[model samples]
Target: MGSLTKNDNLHIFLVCFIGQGVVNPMLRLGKAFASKGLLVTLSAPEIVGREIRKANNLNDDQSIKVGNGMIRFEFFDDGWESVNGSKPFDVGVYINHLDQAGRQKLPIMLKKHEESGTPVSCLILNPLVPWVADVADSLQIPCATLWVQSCASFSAYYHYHHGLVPFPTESEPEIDVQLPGMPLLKYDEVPDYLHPRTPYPFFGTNILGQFKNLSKNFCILMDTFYELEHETIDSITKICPIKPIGPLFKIPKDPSSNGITGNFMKVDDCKEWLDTRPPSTVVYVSVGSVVYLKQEQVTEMAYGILNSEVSFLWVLRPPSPHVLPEEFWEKAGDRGKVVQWSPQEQVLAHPATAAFLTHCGWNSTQEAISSGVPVITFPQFGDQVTNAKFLVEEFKVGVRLSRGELENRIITRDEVERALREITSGPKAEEVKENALKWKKAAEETVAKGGNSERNLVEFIEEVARKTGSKHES
Candidate 1:
């Protein structure tokens, strides 16, 4: 990367959540801005910066990872972690600490940026972290929120905004969440953070409640595409600036995120396995980050897959301390390959991958549709339950395990097979596959030259720049 002569127009600074889990897409996004001659400053902790260095070698002034221009991720520590028990920070608890830290340190971070002459012209953030706006307020930087999850979460809250979702006694915790042009999902179907009864609130509620307040000020940036969620997206727009900007994807590029790819782990012969499979013969199973399955569920599901007798690829997490169970490994020996992670976009791009067995996390859900693959929802927790309902009921593009009850601890083999059949052999599947392909096309188009998400992102950069260094930035 060569030094910039004097181009200030192409500079941007992106602030992300804890960083790493989804950095590749953000990395790609930053590279895109850089390709246009923009210089991006990524703000986060030092550890995140190291991950960036490993990915792009940011500190190496001559590294091409800088491509069109360059990126330099700086550090920001607010000194509140000491107050909380240190090791293995809880996400909810960490975020609470993070919010408090933001108040104490963002002002200093902005001051450093201003002193350095590369002050951010704009700020992009994952939602509800008021500190982002606080930075914008203190340093007069412009900002926007990345909702990260599907619009359904925000849409449900919007229903609350419009006086539709009820606030009945917390005792009768579950309620019917009804939205137009969408399925009527039960209260348990919503993400725990958005719902009142989940174990999260009693412990994480105050900060999460503050999380909702983030929307009133900044634009609501959704990672979902318009075609699939346009109706619901339309519904969200009635109240706030709904900018649907992605099915944001990136393929195998680095080893920071591992799996059986050249950059990391390797599956010596998946190509041969894939070659034997006919069109749509393979079912891809993946439960993304933060999902932990009990050994019993894993055992039963393995038996179910053997029962289904279909070619499959299951992405399993490296168990405690990053090593998987030998039993799980031995069982998957010939029929399946389990890895810590893989290049998801490329996996979905494979022709053999017909249906996905998923936990229905937003990015994975969007990516499945983005690649024209339908899903078999085996929701675990969080936003997954809501996403699953939308997948099976509202979109008709996927199927869910008809678990007689909504609890996570008791899924059986029959339900697993039911999920398998519902997605793989149903009468409605063909039509669903067709719609999935259509949505995939729609998603691709949005990332193309003038597509909605693409255009929205570019326009958003402009807005952030236009509003930067203003008290009314958000």
Candidate 2:
């Protein structure tokens, strides 16, 4: 038997960035930890915390029950009043403020927990908040990172950070990166922020900064399954104690109870509309929460769906002025449904969902893969560039609309229509569908009872217990 006792009183503190993409996975991971009988507390910025509480209808205490265990929510002040479109927001400034605020407030929270006799046994953080490790280090706590992107992307970052592979420089802008156990990636195919001509070069610098303090972290908890990225995971495990324990979103037995309420926006009810559609007929379109589309891009997308003559459910956030003309709606009558937000997992799992038009965020990518639905990749930024590469080239489960150069290039309606048709009913559709289902089966097995991810998570808990010197009665 594993040395983890039920309700073992081992408290874990998990921290993440403030995007829905980052928050959702960390919450899912918290639930996973809670299911394993650990006390889990998750914290992001105060702004996100307020939204999550309001969205979930959570009480002032902000706690939820998961199986035999429980998970709690806490918020740290990041000096942001609220995130409305009216305010002037700067990513670099916000990140700097977040760092300063977190470093100041985190130690106090830890001390409070310790005084309450529920001392944290471990600290887990997502990327872009590397300073959390330093705080954990000073507190003499075991810290691990939950890498929220693909293992392939992680490998790329790791290699680039350690100088283990060749990367393009400003002077030599056309070089390709060749990493072990993966395909050779052109300068453009690497992570968008890591590319030489990237607009947000600070993101690449921050990512490498995380690696600079890698020795302080005890392990990396990857949000991937072994079967999906075994070779890349193996390559990484040779360097660090990397554990693959994800495809982290829970598969609820009851379809009615999706239990996903961490969204920052209001979720629209599209299930009724989805139920009316025929099986495998609807193309689910969402670019996630962060990617803002230009009015022209929105018009092209609208016309593209219209041009393809396919039923679509698109999540277009509010305040999109002068896009999706009135004529477009009239023409789309009864066949198209546009909403501000949606319960994406429920939508993806529905029989009506045939293909996902995605921004290729890691959360969306894994969710689509887990649902066994093929995708039309429209990556916007960051590690999404590398994710799109794997989806089309490595996984063979998606078709690409853009090559991650969307900033300089605008894909036309024809391109979108062609990619949509290619994924939905083209000659290669069945093959891609088969591959998607195959990976879905592998993912299921990896998280099932006594499966690779399950075993790894259990072993990880045991290792934590040992390192923290917590006595577990078998």
Candidate 3:
């Protein structure tokens, strides 16, 4: 941990969970730090590592150099089985298993790196894995927690932690969620895990623990922007030191967003198909890799797209059963392409992409904003609801289907068609596109040479250096 000469590499060890949401941004952040001439070793789930190699066509443990060997990738066993079949995953079991593996093996890995003279200076971790902080503590190294969601959701969680937001009780017609310094939210609209009726109190407690661990840290990094959620960012500044250093990705220029790793599915070439469509005519639909869709939801969307009379590209990952009606292909023919996966950034940036029917995940939402594409926020759970709220109210570039219309009941084809038209080619579509472009410019400006996001990330580099250093200059 001592101060080193210019020849000595400054190593940063990062640990993340197994999903694309966590791994995608972590790779972006890793590349950013690597670009700054720091050594980054990103440890991800073993399964993710395998997929990255397959997607990128690489050998085992072969390092793909970013910044001329400044950044390298590594993998670790999470002691969890790969999900198979249509069975729902046991969340608690997965958490416990990953935590156990991390606690047992992470320290050993750190020590091995240190002994090899590639000494690790700091540990960066996903907030969901609170046990990694304990690993950092035991190793006597400084750690920082990464908050990958929106600042609004982060603040809501903090407020809930401090007894400001009301905990869910029995289900009412509607409960008002008035968190401090943020927009008013209905309890039905808040994160599902926060509801008492939901069967995941343990997961809720784990989320709360992330804030607790973050509050104790000297450094906190958010994959968000200052201008996007200034008030919520300022509010959380009172609790702990935080720096918003993201929308941490380069906007893709081509239809196939190249050089991205950790894709669990094979990405299809929809750019050729996109070329056939007119500008501002196609509806791009993806519910994200993590959110599973029910048959009813899929049916509604399918019929809605058919009824909307618009060309569409839907990225429905494999193992999704019987969602699309058989021989509907015969009816629609060449109007739409339903692939297992499509390049999201490129699709959003494509001129043909008129609207994004999204599940409102943070990664997707931010990518949509960065690309200047209007959103149809179809939230499933967690911070997505908060993000959907922000998209509808704060940005004015998106619209949401009313929860009352589709909460318990199956969403009708009429509802889907209506919302699609309203957000796409209807009266507000042009206005929505304009606002989307405005946010896009703001996002680009913030990540440019002298932008606040880059500047703040530079500031964090120096702070992490000092915290992880054994001795420092006055």
Best-fitting candidate, measured by TM-score?
Answer: 2
lDDT of 3 at 228: 89
Compared with the true structure, what per-residue lDDT tens digits does model 1 show for residues 1-474?
344344345456666556444454455456556654567766665445445555443333522334456655666764544665557766666666777776676677667767977566766665535567765655555566666678877676556545666632377676676776456767777565555555555422432453555644467666777777888777768767878877766221333223211121332345556666677877888886567776677777876776666667877774553344455456566656655665577678888778888888788888887888998887776677888887777766787773222374667777776667667776867877987888788877887877887788778766764454222322
For each candidate in turn, give its C-alpha RMSD to the true structure in angstroms: 5.6, 3.3, 3.7
TM-score of 1: 0.82
Residue-level lDDT of model 2, residues 1-474, one tens digit each, is: 465554446788999787777887787777777877788898888878877877776656877776656788888777666533566877776777788888998999999999998888999987788889999999998999988888888888888888887788889887988888788887888887887788789888877767888778888888899988888887778888889988888432322123646667777999999988999999999987667888888888888898888889999985536468777788788788988888998998999989999989888888888889998999888888888888888889999899775358778999988988888896778888889898888888888888898888888888888876666443
TM-score preference between candidates 1 and 3, better one? 3
Best by lDDT: 2
How do these models rank on TM-score, best leading? 2, 3, 1
Model 3, span 343-426: residue lDDT tens: 888899999998898888888889999999998888877777778888888888897864422266777788788878887765
Error of 3 at 295 (Å): 2.4
Instruction: Point out where model 2 deviates above 4 Å.
Output: 1-8, 66-68, 78-87, 251-260, 318-322, 325-327, 472-474
Model 3 global lDDT (CA atoms, 0 to 1)? 0.77
Give the lDDT of residue 16 in candidate 1.
59
